[PDB]
Design a protein around this ligand. Structure first.
Ligand SMILES: [Cl-]
Ligand SMILES: [Cl-]
Length: 162
């Protein structure tokens, strides 16, 4: 298993504009288009992202291209983030994947917000990280997904995904 397969499982794949769990316009594999309540604004963002007049529909290949970009950016975001880099540097490969997942979902700022979890992660206090990360809006809103990520972070294995 890997970060792509992991996120593909968590976000799913949709070829038409849709609303995410928060009600935002999204497409493909969890690619947020906009936080604005307008489908048109969404259609505009889409066309600009893809480079053509889509009419709110893309192909698989197109979705996958956005996905590649998104993963790359999350990784790059982490490494440029002062609060995030060090955590990531200290982790093993599977747990890094968990951190990338969180960043892909909530953005750098959101993750940087788990200050206490991050510190504990750096100290390798696995059970404490899991307890602390669950006390969050993140966990209350999308619990099944959050559970999968937390387990991953806690155990350092892909069990939750198999
Ligand atoms: Cl984009
Ligand atoms: Cl969920």
């Amino acid at each position: 298993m890997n970060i792509f397969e992991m996120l593909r499982i968590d976000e799913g794949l949709r070829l038409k504009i849709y609303k995410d769990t928060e009600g935002y316009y999204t497409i493909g594999i969890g690619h947020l288009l906009t936080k604005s309540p307008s489908l048109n604004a969404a259609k505009s963002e889409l066309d600009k992202a893809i480079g053509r007049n889509t009419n709110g529909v893309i192909t698989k290949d197109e979705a996958e291209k956005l996905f590649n970009q998104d993963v790359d950016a999350a990784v790059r975001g982490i490494l440029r983030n002062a609060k995030l880099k060090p955590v990531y540097d200290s982790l093993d490969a599977v747990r890094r994947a968990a951190l990338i997942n969180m960043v892909f979902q909530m953005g750098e700022t959101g993750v940087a917000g788990f200050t206490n979890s991050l510190r504990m992660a750096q100290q390798k206090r696995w059970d404490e990280v899991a307890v602390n990360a669950a006390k969050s809006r993140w966990y209350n809103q999308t619990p099944n997904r959050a559970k999968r990520v937390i387990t991953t972070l806690r155990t350092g294995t892909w069990d939750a995904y198999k």
